[PDB]
Design a protein around this ligand. Structure first.
Ligand SMILES: [Mn+2]
Ligand SMILES: [Mn+2]
Length: 251
């Protein structure tokens, strides 16, 4: 089978000092995607032996940025969603493999008090169209930090967070609409009833020790890939970021 991993590392240089490479080497992923590199490829000093590495860096320094590491050479790689307005923040890398596209994405956060919600809505409209356009050729696997918790089971204090970024009605609706367009939330495909499964914890005192968190990191796949799925993973014990890694296994 193949093992795919995704991790918002909250700054790759920071995460490296907190053991990133130890988990990278240990999990031995066929494809390992990261979000929030917060660095430029030119300044990379780290070695990912045995992997191709593809970087997408923001114009703004020390901001956002994603990287895809893959053992297998892709058939093609693209960056962004082919819209200049949305392609300035180092957020999307798409690697084409033989039987699917793998889209690595760091979704724009709506920010405190939902100040960037209007832009986020425009992002969601275009991102969905981008994914459907890919599906004209091949099914799609999406992974990354999507900055949305879907249902009440997906975060610790639902009723007090509906005006916070990631759990607004507006964001939840776009994620529902994304799935209604033909995508599977793989973790909930295998574990629909699992409570307290989170991938992000705030800096509230001991939040992570108490597992007061949200699930906002995902693997999604086109409906026809359903029969190839083997498992969906949350690496809750891996430290080094305010997010933990997520994973997908398939044949
Ligand atoms: Mn961060
Ligand atoms: Mn060749």
């Amino acid at each position: 089978f193949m093992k795919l991993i995704s991790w918002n590392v909250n700054g790759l240089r920071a995460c490296m000092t907190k053991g990133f490479m130890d988990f990278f080497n240990s999990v031995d992923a066929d494809v390992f995607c990261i979000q929030e590199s917060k660095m430029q490829q030119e300044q990379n000093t780290f070695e990912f032996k045995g992997y191709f590495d593809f970087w997408n860096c923001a114009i703004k320094k020390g901001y956002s940025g994603v990287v895809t590491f893959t053992k297998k050479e892709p058939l093609s790689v693209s960056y962004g969603i082919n819209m200049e307005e949305h392609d300035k923040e180092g957020r999307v890398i798409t690697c084409e493999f033989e039987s699917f596209y793998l889209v690595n994405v760091y979704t724009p956060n709506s920010q405190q008090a939902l100040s960037r919600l209007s832009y986020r809505m425009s992002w969601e409209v275009e991102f969905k169209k981008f994914l459907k356009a890919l599906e004209l050729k091949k099914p799609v696997i999406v992974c990354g930090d999507l900055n949305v918790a879907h249902n009440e089971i997906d975060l610790e204090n639902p009723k007090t967070n509906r005006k916070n970024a990631g759990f607004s009605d507006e964001e939840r609706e776009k994620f529902s609409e994304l799935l209604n367009a033909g995508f599977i939330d793989t973790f909930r495909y295998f574990y629909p009833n699992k409570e307290k499964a989170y991938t992000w914890w705030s800096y509230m005192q001991q939040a992570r020790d108490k597992n007061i968190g949200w699930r906002i990191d995902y693997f999604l796949c086109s409906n026809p890939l359903k029969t190839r799925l083997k498992d969906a993973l949350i690496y809750k014990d891996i430290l080094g970021s305010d997010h933990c890694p997520v994973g997908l296994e398939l044949v």
